[model samples]
Target chain A: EVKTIKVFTTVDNTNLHTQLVDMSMTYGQHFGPTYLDGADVTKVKPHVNHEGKTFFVLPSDDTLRSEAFEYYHTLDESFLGRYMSALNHTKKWKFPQVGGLTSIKWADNNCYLSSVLLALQQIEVKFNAPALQEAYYRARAGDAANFCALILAYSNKTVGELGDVRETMTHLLQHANLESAKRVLNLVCKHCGQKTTTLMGVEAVMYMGTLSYDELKAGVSIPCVCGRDATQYLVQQESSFVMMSAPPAEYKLQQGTFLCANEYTGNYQCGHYTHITAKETLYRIDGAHLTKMSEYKGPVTDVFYKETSYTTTI
Target chain B: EVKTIKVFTTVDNTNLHTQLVDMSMTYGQHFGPTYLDGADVTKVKPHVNHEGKTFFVLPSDDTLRSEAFEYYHTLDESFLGRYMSALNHTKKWKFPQVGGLTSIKWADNNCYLSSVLLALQQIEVKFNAPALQEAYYRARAGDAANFCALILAYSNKTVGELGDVRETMTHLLQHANLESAKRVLNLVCKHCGQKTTTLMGVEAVMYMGTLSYDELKAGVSIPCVCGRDATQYLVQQESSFVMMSAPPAEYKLQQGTFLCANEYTGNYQCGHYTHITAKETLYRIDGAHLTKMSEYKGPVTDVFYKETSYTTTI
Candidate 1:
C-alpha cells in the first residue's frame, strides 16, 4: 500500500539541462565552481546571492550537479519567468555573438539552435505541454526544429551552423520562450531547401517604387529561400495605417520591440548582392508611443535586380 | 554523464492521482475491471472502448490501477482536456448527488471538495500553474478551499458536508476546473465566520417588494449572513441588460451550462435561505446551447431571512 515504496528507477541526466544557483544552497556541498565567466552569463544574473560571477562551472558527472540544475530550474516557476525573460532579450544580450547565458557541459556540442531549442522544448516548453503546444502550433510551424531555423534565418543566420562536437555549450536552452519559438515555422525554401535543422533562409520580395504591389503580391510566389513574406520599415506621419497585408503584433502597437537581427545582407542585383529580410522598428512618428513596426516587402531596390547574381538570397 | 542512471529513487503514490485507461494497454494489464457500475461514470465514457458499465473498479492498491488513472489523466494532454471538460459539467453529471465519475478506493474517505479541488489544483490546474493561477486569483479568493465551499453552496450545498471516515470517493477531484474552483472564496459570513473549511453562509438582502435597491445598495451594509450578495433568474423578452453590478461569464454570452447546483434551501419569514450564492445559467433568451446566465442580488422575496434563525445559512 506504500506508494513511496523504494525502487530502483532509471533517471535520465542527459535530457537534463544544467542551471545556475548559489553554491551556498548545496544539498550537501558535493560540488563547486571549476571556473567562472564574466561577460559569459553575466546578463543572466544568479537567482541566489552571488559572488557576481556571471557563471560558474562544475564537474560534468557529479551527482550533486544533476540535482543542482534540477533544483535551479524546478525550485519554483521563477525559472520559467527568468528563462522567458532571457529569450526575449537574447539579441539584446548578444547571445549568438557571445554565447549562451550560462554554460552546461552537456557531456556536449554545437547543435546550436537545435540543441538549445530542443532543450527548451523538452525541458521547459513542454512543462505545460498541451497549453504550450496549442499556443505554439497556432502560431509557428513544424515542431521546435523549424522554430530554431526560422528565428535564425530571421537574424540573417542559418541553422546550417548546426552539427558539430563543441563539448561545451551555454545554458540558453533552459530559457527558450514559447512565443519566440513559434515564429512562423514550416518554411521550406523554394530556393535553399530545409535540412534536418537548417531551414532554408527566409526572405520577402519588396517591390519598391511600384503601384504593382499586387503584381508580385498576386502572381509572384518567388517564395524565395523563405518562410514568411514579410519585411519591415517606417513611414511618414500622416496618421496612417499600412495593412500589415505584417508583423511583434498587438493588433495595435507592439509595446515591446521583439525584432532581432545580425547585421548582414542585400540584393536585386549589384554583383554579389546579399539578400536581406528586415524587421524594422520605425520611430520619429508615434511619439505618443515610441514604437511603430511596419513590414515592407523586399529590401532597398538598387541592388535588387541589378546584381550579377544574388544568393536567390537569404 | 548518465542522466538516466539506474538508482533506487523513492517513488510517491499517495501524492499521485489515479486515472482511467483501457485495461488492454496496462504497462499491458496487471489490472482489470475488478467490477463495473452503470450510471456511475457513464457520463465520463472511457477515452478507450468501454464496457459501458460506467466505471470499472480496479484494486485500490494496484500498480496497473495507479497507471490506469495516470494514463487516463496523462496518456496525452487529453487528460487535461477531459478533466477540464468534466469540471465544467460536474452538476449536469450530478456529481455530489451521485458521486464522482470514477472511484479510487484511495485507501480513502470523504474530504469532499478540498481533496477534489486540491487534487486538481496540484495535478492539472497547476500543470500550467502561473497562467492558471493568474486567471484564478483574478476571479476567486483564498486558495481552493473557499472555491470548494462556494461552488458547493451555489447549488445550496455546504462545506459542512465536509469531514468524515467515509472511504472511496468519486474521481471528480481529478476534473476540478480552474474557472469553477476560483469562484469568490474569501467569504466570511458576518454571521457564521470562517472555519478551518466551513465559512459562513453568503446572503444579500433583496428588498423583494421595494426600491431599497439603492436603500440596501446605499448604506445598508447588511452584508447578509454571507460572502457575496447575488441571486439569479429569468427576465422576460425585454432587451435590457442588468448591470451584473452578477455571474458563468463571457463578457457577453456564456456558452455553456457551467452553473451546478443541489436541490435544497429557504427563508425570510419562511425559514433559512440556506443562504445561497448563485452562478446561474439563464436560458429561454439564448436557446443556442439552452444556456445563458445572470446573477441577482438575493433569492425570492418571501424567504428574505427572518425565521427565528436560518443556519445563518451557507
Candidate 2:
C-alpha cells in the first residue's frame, strides 16, 4: 500500500526563488522544483523526516526516493563521488571510484567526514583494492584499531618483524584484552632491547588518540615497536594518513544528515544538518529550468532524490 | 747560532726496542733508527713537538724536518695529507694540496687543532680550494667563529644574506669592538624578524667560546644566522663535523720525548712526551734491517727525521 503527493515549495528569499526556478528547469527532465513549504502551493509535496529535519520530497517513487536519500546521508559511493568532485574540481586531482565504497563505513555518528575521506584518498593512492577491501570491512564494522593495524601492516612492510608485532598489539587492543595487549607490547619492547616497563608502554598506547594535538606538549613516553617514542611514531602515522578525532561543536546535531550520536547524551546531537540556506548558494531543478535558489533558509535533506506524488495506479 | 751534540741511548723495554729497530730498517731508506738517549752516541736524533708530545728524529734535511714538524703541530697541509692518508688509506681519496698552506697562518696557541682539521676535511669534500682556503686562514688564526661562518656560508647557500651578516659579526668580534658586535647581532635578528633584545644576542655570542662541551649542558641561547639557537646551531655544526674536546688525561703531560715548553709553565709539566711504550707496537728501519721495535717503553720524538752527527767542519 503506497501513496504519493505532489510537492511544491514556497519562496522566502526572492534570489532563492530565481535560483530554484533555474535549477528546476535545468534538471527538470530528471527531477522537479526546489522547495520551501511556508506558503501553500497548488501542488502538494511529499515530506520525510531525516535526522529530525523535514524535507519536501522531489518527484519520484518512494523506493527510489528512499534509496537516494539513504545514499546521500550515509555517504555512499555516489555522495562521496559528488563531495570529492565539489572539493577537487580539477580532473588531475580527482579520486578514482574503486569497488563500491570499498573501505569506508557509514558511521551515523561519525562527524569527521572530511578527515575520513582524506584517509580513504591516501589508502586509494597507496594500496590496491584487495588491501583496501580488508581495511574497508574493518572500518565498516567500527574496528578502528584493526583498520589502523591493516593500514600499518600493508604500508610499512619495510619495518620487518616489527610490523607483525604492531599488528598483533593492535589486534589485542581491539578485543579489549588488556592482559594480552600488555604481553605483546612487552615482547616488542624486549625484542627491541628496551627495558621500559609494560605499564609505561600501555599508557603510551592510551595517549595515541591525543597525539595529534598534544605532540609538542609533554605526556607519557611510549616506544613504538620500531623503537621511536610514541610522539615520533604518531607523527609518522599522521604524515602517512589522517587519524581520527572527536567532532567539533559546530558539527554537533541539527539533523537531516549523517550524524553520530553522542556517547554521553545517547542522542544524535553531534552532527550537522545540511541546510540549504540563503547564506550559501544552492541550486534546484524543475522541468526545462535549472534555477539558482538564493536566500532560502531551509533544510534539503532528501535533495539527493527525485521527487514525485505517490499515486495508486491500480 | 746553532750548536751540535752527540746523542746516545739506553733501553729498558726490550719489546719496544725491537719494534723501533724493525721500523728503522723498514723506513731506513727514508729515515733512520729511533733512539733513547741515556749514554753517549755518535748519531744525533732531531726532535719535534706534537700536541706537547716529543718524538725522536727520523732522517731528512733540517729544512724539511722543521717544516714537517711545524705542520704536524700547527696542522698545515702536510699534516692534513698524512692524516688523510692514515684514515682514508686509499690514494684515490686524497685531497689535493693547494697553494703552499694558502690562507693558513701559524698560530702558536691554537688548541682547537682537531676541530680545524675536521673543518678542513668537510670543506675538501664539499667545496673547492677557494672555499677551503677561506676557512683555513680563519682556523689557523684561531678565529673559530669565522671558520664556522665560512663553512656555513659555502655549504648552505640558501642563507645567502646571513653569510654576509655572520662575516660582519665575526669581523667586529675579532676587533673586540663590543658596540659594533651588538649592532650587527641586532641587525641579523631584525633581518630574521625576531623581537628578542640585542643584549641577549650579544651575551649568546660571547658564550660561543664555551659552546664546545658546555653545549650538552644548558647555557645562553645565541641564534645561528639561520635562526637556530646558538647551542643548537653549534650542536648541528658539531654533528656535521668532528667536534673538539679536551684531549684525554692519558695524552696529558707525561715524560719521555719531544715536548713543547708551556709559556706559563716553563718546566716539562706543561709538555707531554710521546712515549711509544710496548703497549703500542712501533716499527723502525735501521739500514737493511726492517726490525720490529718491541717491548720498548720510551719516547720517539721527531721520529720522522734522520739520525746524523751534528758536526762543524773547519
Candidate 3:
C-alpha cells in the first residue's frame, strides 16, 4: 500500500492556514521569525527569505487537537485579523455618534461584545461565580441584540449583589493603576482557562493601529514586549487570531482631565491612555483617566462628566 | 538592487516547459533524473522512481537549435511523430477506386520521389557528375507528376547514357549488400548537408512494422546494436523522424519462389514478409530478403518476379 501525506498547494489561502496550524500543533509553538527543521531551528531568518519556503507537517498529538478545538470554539475563529484590519473605519463608524446603529459598526461591536462576554464567562467559571457565569451564558445563548445589551449592562453595573465577587470584577476594570490593570486582566484570563499561547498569540492584534504621522515619517518600528522589532509579525498574528473586531475612533482628551477613577487609591492618574482610533487604529491618549463610565464612546460624554465635580465614582 | 529569478508554478504545463528551458539555459545540461541543489545533483535516481517524477531540461548548444531549424524548415514539423504512425495503407493507394481523382496517392508518391530525387542530386554533386546531377535536379525541381514519370523512366533504363555514373548510382540501389546500401545512404545525407545527429537519429524509423506474435506473447525485448534493451530508445527515435510513410498491407508469398535477383551474390533469396496484423504491430520475416523492386507494395507485383528465367539485373 502506498502512503501519502497531506500536501498543500502553495496557491490556496486555506491550505496555507491549515499548513501553519498543522505545523504549529505538530512542532509546538514557533515564535519570532526563524526557519525550523523537523525538530530544531534550521536557520535564523524572516518569515520568508532567500532560502526555499518551509511548511509544517501534521502532528500526532490528540491533546493538541482538543486544545485547538476548545480555543477556537469560544472565539469567532473565522474572522481573520487581516480582514478586520482592512475595514473602513470612517465610513463604518461616523464620529461623534454614539451607537446610532450604523449597520457595519453595530454588527462589529456585537462581535467584540461576544468575545468579551466569552472571556468574562471563562472568568466566572474560574472563580466559580454562578451568577456571573449564568448571565454570560444567557447572553451567549440568546439573540445578538440581547447579547450586546447584556454585555453593556454588566459593564455598567458591578453586580453589587454578589458582594466580594463584585469587588473582584470591578477591580479587573479599574484603569487608574496600569500595572494593576494589566495584572488583573492577566489573572482573569488565566482563571478563565485561556491558554497563555493563545493570549500571547492575540497580543499582536494590539499593534495594528496607524502610527503617528511623525513616527511614520521617521519609519519607527513597532516594538514587541521582548524588545524585538515587530515589522514581520502581522502574518503570523493574522494566522493565529480568529476574530479582530473594529477599533475605536480617534479622540484625544485634554491634559489633567479625569478619564477613570483609581479603585485602590481613589485618585486618578493624569497620564496618557491608548484607545482604538479607527478600524485597526489604537492611538495613545493625551490626558488622564475618567470615572464611572460603562463604555468608551469618545473623549467627552454627558454620562461621565455632568457639569463640574461630577458625582459619578469608581 | 534586488535580483530575482522567474519562478514557475509546477502544476501548469506551459510553466513547466518554460522553467525547464530557463534552468537549462541558466545552468548547463542536466543528464539523467536527479534532484539538483541549485547547481549540483542532490539525489541520484532514475528518470522516474518511487520518490517522484522528473522532467527534461532543454539543451543549450547553439548547433542543436540550428539543426532543429533545418530539419523542420521543409518538412511539416507540426505533424508529430505519433500522428505519422496512424495513416491507412489501402485508402492512400486506391486500386481502381471510385474517387477517380483519388490520384492523391500518385501525388503523395511524387512527394516521396522529390525527397529521393533531392538526395540523388546531392549524391551526384558529391561525385561531381554534372550529367547525373542535372537529371536528378530536373526531377526534384519539376512538377510532382513529371518527377514521378522521370523516376519511373530512369528506373526502367538505369541511365545507360551516363556510362560510369550510371554504374555508381545503380550499385547504391542494389540491396544485396546491406553495408554498402547503408554507407551510400549516409553519404547521400552528408552530401545533402543533413546533420549527422539527425541522420543517426532517423535510422531507427525502420523498426516499427509488425512484431512476431510469439515473441510479443513471450515478452521478448528488442535489443539495440549496443545490446541494451530498446524500450526507452524508441521514444527518442520517434521524436527525431518526420515522415513515416504508410506501410504495405499483409500478404504472404509461396516458398521456393524467386523473390529477387541479387546483383552481387547472383543467388535469389526467396522470402515470406510479415506485416502489421493491427496498428503498430511489428513482425519479423519468416524467411529471407527480397529484391528487384523499386517500391515496397504488396508481395506480388510485375516489377519483381514473373515467369521462370525472367532476367532483371541492376
Predicted candidate 2 versus true structure: per-residue lDDT over B137-195, tens digit per residue: 32332223223433332222211121122233333223222232221122224345534
Residue lDDT tens for model 3, B1-314: 42323332221111232232322222223232212211112132222221232232221233223322331221322111111111111112211111111111223222222223323322212212222222222222221222222233334321112112123224323311222111011111212332222223223222233222122222334443455444211212222111122133333322333222111111123222221111122211111111232232353211112121111122
Off by over 4 Å in 2: A1-115, A122-239, A242-270, A273-314, B1-314
CAPRI tier for the interface of model 1: incorrect
Tell me the lDDT of model 2 at B205. Answer: 33
Q: TM-score: which candidate is best?
A: 1
What TM-score does chain A of model 1 get? Answer: 0.20
Calculate candidate 2's fnat. Answer: 0.00
Score chain A of model 2 by TM-score against the reference chain A: 0.21
Error of 3 at B11 (Å): 55
Which runs of model 1 end up more than 4 angstroms from their true locations? A1-314, B1-49, B52-314
TM-score of chain A of each: 0.20, 0.21, 0.20
| lDDT score for residue B312 of model 2 | 17
Candidate 3 residue lDDT tens string, A8-91: 221111123223322222222433221122112222222322134343222233333332232222122211111111111111
Candidate 1's clash total is 40
Off by more than 4 A, model 3 = A1-157, A160-220, A224-233, A236-314, B1-314
Instruction: Judging by lDDT, tell me the better candidate of 2 and 3.
Output: 2
